[PDB]
């Protein structure tokens, strides 16, 4: 087989800027059949360059791809919000084994934005049910990168949260991030201080959001 | 209009077999060849078989041969994946694809792409999820939070939209997560002014195609 190997792993840059793209052969690639795709996430790929450097139907001009051999090139010139995806290159001049790319994932770069955040104590009906789930919400962010801490009680938590982050938005290029604490029912109930503590890039001290489990 | 539709996926237990339509239309389907391509969650992509557009030229990836075949019927604008002793390495979302047109050979590059239809190989039960509401509090700057948690589900995919598809500025619905029970978890969020609290109602529609279950949620301040 023919491995493709993309850099790299990831690109950040701000709107209007140039983002190139590199995809090496372990062998040459016949008659330059090389293809670039464009994947937002839920969608299926979407096609830009095949044969190197013929554009696909309805693709701008700022996707521009290059090269030759064992080393191809695709150019996004003029980066919009819209551009948030990854990149995969694509050979098939080879025996029918055609091979994929790891992918290049592209991030719009913006002013830093602290999150604004909130915290959310079991519910009732949750709690009726066995199983008790605090969530804590960052809403509206940027950079990616934040740090968030579950203390019970002001004993720190380690192993027991599980976080999940929303693409990047499409107007106004943020992020949102939700950190999910599970525990026993009965171990929530034998606790009263419940915080989420947030550390980021656009604040000079990490925020606290906490409940007592007398709240109301 | 060129169209593809993926159709036939869903859960399978290991060893299992499971077959794959994809119906086409807004070209000469006879003068295609007709590929599959699959995608595991999270990962990248992988070409799967391809068939000519008279059926004289079937090529397999390595990982598939002797499991999979693939079949095409041009009076129906068809083509077709049976897939025998499924494995786990084979859940991915499965995509039906067409060449740019004019290409020299069988298998090149894809221009059109269906939707995609999700096989989800693994011996777990089916099992719709909880949905517990997230109640707003008493406040960043005037902004509320409020949300639904879709708790404890299998397999994958759920969807949720805020009254009804109405509301949807300020929604943040995040990707699932996979617990250590094997089963799966979202949550789907919504800031709002305080103040909307008393003059709107917030209802999370969650629907779990894979167990038929619609869940709506009315959120509430506590
Ligand atoms: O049989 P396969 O697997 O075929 C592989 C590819 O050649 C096709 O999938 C296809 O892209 C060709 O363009 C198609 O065929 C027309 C030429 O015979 C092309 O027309 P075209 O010149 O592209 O013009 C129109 C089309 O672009 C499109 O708009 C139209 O069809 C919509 O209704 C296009 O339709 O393999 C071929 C190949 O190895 C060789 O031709 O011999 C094999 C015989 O089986
Ligand atoms: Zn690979």
């Known amino acids: 087989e023919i491995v493709l190997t993309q850099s790299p792993g990831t690109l950040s840059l701000s709107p209007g800027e140039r983002a190139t793209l590199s995809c090496r052969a372990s062998?040459?690639?016949?008659?330059?059949?090389l293809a670039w795709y464009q994947q937002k996430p839920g969608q299926a790929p979407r096609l830009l360059i095949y044969?190197?450097?013929r554009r696909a139907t309805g693709i701008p001009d700022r996707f521009s791809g290059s090269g030759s051999a064992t080393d191809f090139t695709l150019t996004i010139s003029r980066l919009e919000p819209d551009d948030f995806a990854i990149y995969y290159c694509?050979?098939?001049?080879?025996?029918?084994?055609?091979?994929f790319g790891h992918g290049t994932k592209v991030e719009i770069k913006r002013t830093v934005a602290a999150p604004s955040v909130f915290i959310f104590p079991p519910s009732d009906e949750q709690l009726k049910s066995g199983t008790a789930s605090v969530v804590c919400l960052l809403n509206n962010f940027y950079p990616r990168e934040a740090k968030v801490q579950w203390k019970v009680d002001n004993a720190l938590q380690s192993g027991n949260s599980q976080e999940s982050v929303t693409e990047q938005d499409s107007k106004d290029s943020t992020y949102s991030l939700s950190s999910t604490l599970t525990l026993s029912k009965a171990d929530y109930e034998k606790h009263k201080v419940y915080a989420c503590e947030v550390t980021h890039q656009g604040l000079s001290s990490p925020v606290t959001k906490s409940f007592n489990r007398g709240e109301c | 209009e060129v169209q593809l539709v993926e159709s036939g996926g869903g859960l399978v237990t290991p060893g299992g077999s499971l077959r794959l339509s994809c119906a086409a239309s807004?070209?000469?389907?006879?003068?295609?060849?007709m590929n599959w391509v699959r995608q595991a969650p999270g990962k990248g992509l992988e070409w799967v078989s391809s068939?000519?557009?008279?059926?004289?030229?079937?090529y397999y990836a390595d990982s598939v041969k002797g499991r999979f075949t693939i079949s095409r019927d041009n009076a129906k604008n068809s083509v077709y994946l049976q897939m025998t002793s499924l494995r786990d390495e084979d859940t991915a979302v499965y995509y039906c694809?067409?060449?740019?047109?004019?290409?020299?050979?069988?298998?090149?590059?894809?221009?059109?792409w269906g939707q995609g239809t999700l096989v989800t190989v693994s011996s777990a039960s089916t099992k719709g999820p909880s949905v517990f509401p997230l109640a707003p509090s008493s406040t960043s700057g005037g902004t509320a939070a409020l949300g639904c948690l879709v708790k404890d589900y299998f397999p994958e995919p759920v969807t949720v939209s805020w009254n009804s598809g109405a509301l949807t500025s300020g929604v943040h619905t995040f990707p699932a997560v996979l617990q250590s029970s094997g089963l799966y978890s979202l949550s789907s969020v919504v800031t709002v002014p305080s103040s909307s609290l008393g003059t709107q109602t917030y209802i999370c529609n969650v629907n779990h195609k894979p167990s038929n279950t619609k869940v709506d949620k009315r959120v509430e301040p506590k």
């Open positions: 044969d190197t450097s």
């Open positions: 694809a067409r060449d740019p047109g004019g290409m020299p050979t069988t298998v090149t590059t894809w221009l059109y």
């Open positions: 807004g070209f000469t389907f006879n003068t295609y060849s």
């Open positions: 694509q050979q098939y001049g080879s025996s029918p084994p055609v091979t």
């Open positions: 068939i000519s557009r008279s059926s004289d030229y079937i």
């Open positions: 062998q040459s690639v016949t008659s330059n059949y």
